[PDB]
Write a protein that binds this ligand. Sequence first.
Ligand SMILES: C[C@H]1O[C@H](O[C@H]2[C@H](O)[C@@H](O)[C@@H](O[C@H]3[C@H](O)[C@@H](O)[C@H](O)O[C@@H]3CO)O[C@@H]2CO)[C@H](O)[C@@H](O)[C@@H]1N[C@H]1C=C(CO)[C@@H](O)[C@H](O)[C@H]1O
Ligand code: PLP
Ligand code: PLP
Ligand code: GLC
Ligand code: GLC
Ligand code: GLC
Lengths: 824, 827
Amino acid sequence: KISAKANPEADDATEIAGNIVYHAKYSPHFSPLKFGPEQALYATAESLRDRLIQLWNETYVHFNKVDPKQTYYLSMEYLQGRALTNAIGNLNLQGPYADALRTLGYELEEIAEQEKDAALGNGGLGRLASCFLDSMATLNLPAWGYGLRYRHGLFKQIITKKGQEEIPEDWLEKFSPWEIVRHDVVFPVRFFGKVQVNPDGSRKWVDGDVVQALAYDVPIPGYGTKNTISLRLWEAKARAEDLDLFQFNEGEYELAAQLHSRAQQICTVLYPGDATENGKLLRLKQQFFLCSASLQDIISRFHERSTTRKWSEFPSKVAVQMNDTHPTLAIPELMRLLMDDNGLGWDEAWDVTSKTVAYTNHTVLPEALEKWSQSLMWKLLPRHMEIIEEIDKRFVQTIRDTRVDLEDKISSLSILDNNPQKPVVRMANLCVVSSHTVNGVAQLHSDILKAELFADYVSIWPNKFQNKTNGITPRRWLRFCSPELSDIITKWLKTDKWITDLDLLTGLRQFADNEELQSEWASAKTANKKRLAQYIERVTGVSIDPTSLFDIQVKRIHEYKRQLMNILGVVYRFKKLKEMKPEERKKTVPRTVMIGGKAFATYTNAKRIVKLVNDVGDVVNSDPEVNEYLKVVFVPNYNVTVAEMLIPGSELSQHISTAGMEASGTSNMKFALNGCLIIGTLDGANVEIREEVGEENFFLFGATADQVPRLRKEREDGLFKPDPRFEEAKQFVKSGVFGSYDYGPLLDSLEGNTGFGRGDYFLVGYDFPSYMDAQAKVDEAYKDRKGWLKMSILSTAGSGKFSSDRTIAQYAKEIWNIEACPVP
Amino acid sequence: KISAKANPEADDATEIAGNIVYHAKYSPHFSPLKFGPEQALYATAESLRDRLIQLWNETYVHFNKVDPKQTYYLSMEYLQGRALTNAIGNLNLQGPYADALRTLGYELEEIAEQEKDAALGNGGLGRLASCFLDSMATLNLPAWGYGLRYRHGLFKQIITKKGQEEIPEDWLEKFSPWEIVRHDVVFPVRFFGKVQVNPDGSRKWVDGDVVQALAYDVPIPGYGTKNTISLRLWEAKARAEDLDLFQFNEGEYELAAQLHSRAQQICTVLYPGDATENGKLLRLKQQFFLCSASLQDIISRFHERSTTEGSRKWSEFPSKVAVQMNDTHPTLAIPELMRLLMDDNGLGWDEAWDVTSKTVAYTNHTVLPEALEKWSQSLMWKLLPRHMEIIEEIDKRFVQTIRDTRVDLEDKISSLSILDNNPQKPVVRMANLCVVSSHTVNGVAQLHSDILKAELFADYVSIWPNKFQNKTNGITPRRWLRFCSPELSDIITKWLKTDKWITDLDLLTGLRQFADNEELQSEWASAKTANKKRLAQYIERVTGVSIDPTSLFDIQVKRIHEYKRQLMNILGVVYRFKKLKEMKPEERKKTVPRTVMIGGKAFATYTNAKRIVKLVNDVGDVVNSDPEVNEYLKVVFVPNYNVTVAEMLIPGSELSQHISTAGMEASGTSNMKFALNGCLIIGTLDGANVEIREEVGEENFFLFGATADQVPRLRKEREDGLFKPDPRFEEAKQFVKSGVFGSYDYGPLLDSLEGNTGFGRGDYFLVGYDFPSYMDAQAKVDEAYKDRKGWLKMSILSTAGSGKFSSDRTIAQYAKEIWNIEACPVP
Ligand SMILES: C[C@H]1O[C@H](O[C@H]2[C@H](O)[C@@H](O)[C@@H](O[C@H]3[C@H](O)[C@@H](O)[C@H](O)O[C@@H]3CO)O[C@@H]2CO)[C@H](O)[C@@H](O)[C@@H]1N[C@H]1C=C(CO)[C@@H](O)[C@H](O)[C@H]1O
Ligand SMILES: *Cc1c(COP(=O)(O)O)cnc(C)c1O
Ligand SMILES: *Cc1c(COP(=O)(O)O)cnc(C)c1O
Ligand SMILES: OC[C@H]1O[C@H](O)[C@H](O)[C@@H](O)[C@@H]1O
Ligand SMILES: OC[C@H]1O[C@H](O)[C@H](O)[C@@H](O)[C@@H]1O
Ligand SMILES: OC[C@H]1O[C@H](O)[C@H](O)[C@@H](O)[C@@H]1O
């Protein structure tokens, strides 16, 4: 019926349908006869990519001409999610694309559901990086991300009757229609080898292995702007020359291909397991490979913008941001590139380096900061060790010169820990010593950093440390995932400028009590809940009641996130329902509980928690007697797509980490922004949300951070007195009512008073009573519909501050010193 | 200045330039700023591929609707060469594309020189298969090729001070703009494992390793027709699921990825080295994988063309399908088709065998009986157990036949049967499996096919006297005259007063009446001269030697092998050099200057072949740098011989050498290319030389050497001490051993020409014996070349006689006598 007709700039239904069909025909990846959903997606995605290329190229040419200071963000993860809807939306072509697909016999949703998530990351570190990219593009900032092109991600989670099983991700097994290979953009990265000392006394890293880094671009479109930036990803490749024919033809296939294998290894998965020496080396290879490829690419661009250049311009034209310690090696690597490849002296090269690099810490934990064996570092990266050692030797001399009062502390301040048992390189110390700025990711976290963790460094450089509170993008996380709700907002604010000025959401406050608005809000939530119900049946075969309360905990499965507390809470509520007469049951609040997330494969108890949730759900959900009032579901393969289906339908979300353990929590913000109320500890980003939405719209409970040490010491000393409901939940789990699986060894982590891996270190038992009492409040509040709806609107109305646009603007001004560079 | 504008059907300069620029922008593989030659090529190739897709899709739809009998050709090699010029040319868009590129600031030649050869094959077996594809397309026949998508080819040859070194090919390290991946066309292929026997007596191959075969299409356009067929290539892949995360995360990387590694192995190189057991298994994996993937794809298409009820009746299968096995490599298609019919599709043995026997036909390309593939029964059981069961049942029935209807052949059963149950090295004789199973067996030249009926397969000819046939090899006149020699092709069209020869090559005979015409000779001289300048230019570019375009161009290019007698040639050269050093300058001015060019590749493990390449180079270093004789002689080794190289050498050639020991060559298609481009041959009465010489006429050909029937006798004279060597032959040897060509000891190589008996010695290939009649034929060539009119006359009659050597003739014969297929033109 419809005719192929290329129109790379199509912007109406007919043009778009012609261009989609053009790509179906003349960019084929399949037999021509069938044009089913999958072929439609790739066709549509190529239609959009025509737009994206035009804009990316314009933006590249513009930054080239203006030669502004440019920021480059280094991260080991990016959670890009699906790109289709975000691209349609930033190009403001929703109506036209939807019409185009219908003329081709498809609903956009249908096609959207075919797309795979780019498995390029894992946690909030990666989603932060991605929301930042969106904000850089929309604020017209000259900034890019650089990452690694992982083939298989961390893993795809399957749920079998044995619990979580891990299988590789396949998002590249056919092809990805977003990315643009650049076969001219290749840089060599070395490993192992040694340092040649030249007769003139210059130095050179030689020998070892050389791999090739190949650039692919993923364009990132901004909202209401031509500016389209890049997430540039690196693939490690061997050259064809590196296959040894002689050995292949001798039948020795692994030796023959061993350079190709070492390359493949680097982009196989995120965070490869590192109990062994091999894995530790592979991790370091990953980190180095990203730093070295990216910095060579950055230096190459610095020179390309020359209009004949002097190095002293470098930190006025470049800013590099290290996200956690993973890209620490950018420090010595930049030093290597300056002194060896470009001939600079130490002092000049260090001045440049120190003013270019800045460091973002995301961790409350003292021992979670990366430390590497000095022995491994010498083996893998000998030139970098020389440089790292000279950095430490000068810094220690500074402390003897300028600060004799810290002499006794040199053995913890220095970068090199020369402990005779486990000598290591302390990477956070290298970051802090070298960067012009260090920031944390929430006001409390940043204060802990200045006061406890990095106290003495704050002392030497009192202007080095800063705060930059995390945020989210309101495009992906409200405008695009919750379009019904966004229309309501635009109607009642009488503008749509909130989509780039999120503080305008405070205008909703005056309407929180308004009956018509609450009625509209109920309907949108009800409609988003039907959809979520649908999805849940589709992906777990469980039929959930849309009129019940939707209570959601989705995040990495970890003892400190206290999924176990949640799930024991559920066991308790279930027991009490079985024990009630039917007349008492009709008075409780029906609830559907939803838990999701992934456990590290080797993390035994995390894997036992996932198993537990499922076993509970099998029994609870199939009990005709109480399944009207309670259901429990494990949502599998939690990722961006899943979050996009859960958040708009959520009513209560649980952010209940042990106080002091979380530096932030951006999912918190997504929930708050979509009118979902929180039950939470006064921890991380909960502190800021609760300030912004108001205490009365938030279910606080649990010990506070300053209290926790004291409460552990009470446990060590036999003074802890457990609540009987806590013990009743445990026993009931041990009674074997949830099947043959012995949960005793899991529950053992909550027994005893002292010793590694027991003694309830995360205060599950202790917070259970105030947790369950906050849950009773949530039940009472939910029965008062007007009050509930009021709280939900004030939740959204207070979410202004949590925009990634605010965060990036702050970074741009105080740290990077970059400014808007709009493409005409 | 020019704007992107998609026009998938561009057919004039302006439209084409717009579409090329569209692809530079919206199909990028590079940073956007620079639009240099490389980017221009990929951009131009994608413009052409738009046309190619439209025509391929039309052809697929047409064959689907008509449901004709379809031929599928199975080959382990294809020498596709560069595609750019062939595509422009078959679409008849030379003028428009050349103009388009000039508006973009490029000469087409410049861009064409950027393209890499598709390293999908090695020798004449593969180029035959490719020329056949071009002819299938141009005759509008419903036929396809199926092969393997090799990443690294055989190897790229470099020449170092050590001689030949082998490095992997890189033609896929960026990407290939011709091919079309088909992600819905995936079929599973198994290895190892075992046979489950079901209670109902049905059988099923289970367990082992499973790899995925993924189809990529390379469209093949026909000349002056819409018909565009496929070379469908298979890539072996493992699924993502097959990587073991647990092991990867334990640091055990090789185990973790072992299934991916076994898949990458299959498509790494052509003819992987097989001294070891691992290599033998890998070779068999390659062969099986091509047969099983391709047959599944074929069966799927047979069913897809059903218009009816349920599944269509199997008895139609051999009326709708023909499968051609090229050499013994794809023998496994016999038991595999049997496996698919009986196990997956439930047919009984007899019905399945009737189908199978009428579907498959076999082409032999090999004179010697110890080049035909034999495999250890033990390896076959390991790798392909179900196939062994079936192969065994085939042999059990064939032997019973020879008792139930031919009791007179009882005493020969132990050499006729498929299974050789020798107590030391029991093997499966694959040629015997082919001959027992196929409705037709053919050779590739009239003499070769007669040797097959009379010597090699005599007793099989006895049982099935209509089974055996001849099909003389040929070449495509599109790639090999019209497109490589365009100046010359215009002359031909002008004097024949038509251009219909490009698809009716026999019209070339119309040139004969003009062979004595001085205007035509004058035009011919110019065209050769011009082609020779170009060759001279290329040779400097790739060797660093400056050659004289006025000297005689004498070329031997083919696989380096003792039986091809590059060593004879090279010793001839050493002789001529010695004589030139020994002359006074007055005697030198009377000889005919000559540039000798030798090229080809040695199998990496073949010691003497590698020594010969070393020898040629060492001789050239010394000769070419000698001021005293380099005006009169130069010797050059042309590296990395492939289709591109042949395309540069053939149009500029004057004499070419096809001098194999008589009886050893079944054919020789390069012979034909040379003859077709007016290049005269110095050759033995062997393979295709017999036929060329008949066709061009004896007076236009430099024959020499012993004949096939004489060779045994001449070996027996050597074994008995009766051989009396020519003194010029010994003078050449000694001079090579005197160390005038450097420090390399050539004694062990030359040892192959010494002694009278014993494995690897005694001059088995009669180098020494043919040397005098060879060198005398070389003196004739010198005299004939001095008479320019007579030379030009011979060259024209060479071209004028090349009619019979068209691949169009060969494929038409195959279509009628073997496949029983016919023209199916796309409207
Ligand atoms: C008629 C029969 O044909 C096929 O049987 C083949 C085997 O597939 C093949 O492996 C080979 O088997 C030999 C086997 O490997 C060996 O170990 C055993 O000792 O002897 C076998 C014979 O030498 O050859 C046989 C037969 O020549 C199919 O696999 C069978 O399914 C098929 N049987 C059909 C036919 C009928 C009626 O005609 C049904 O009664 C029967 O249930 C059905 O399976
Ligand atoms: C936002 C997000 C995260 C990070 O959230 P935290 O609970 O705050 O650590 C992780 N996964 C997905 C899929 C997300 O969208
Ligand atoms: C035609 C061709 C061959 C054919 O084989 P011969 O044995 O020379 O006749 C081999 N290689 C190339 C590159 C060819 O074009
Ligand atoms: O959750 C992600 C974490 O997992 C692993 O245990 C890594 O050692 C750590 O680097 C990473 O941040
Ligand atoms: O409880 C904290 C730690 O304990 C266990 O050793 C887990 O395997 C580890 O990944 C986790 O982070
Ligand atoms: O080059 C063609 C031939 O080369 C090798 O000698 C192989 O062993 C053989 O299988 C192949 O046919």
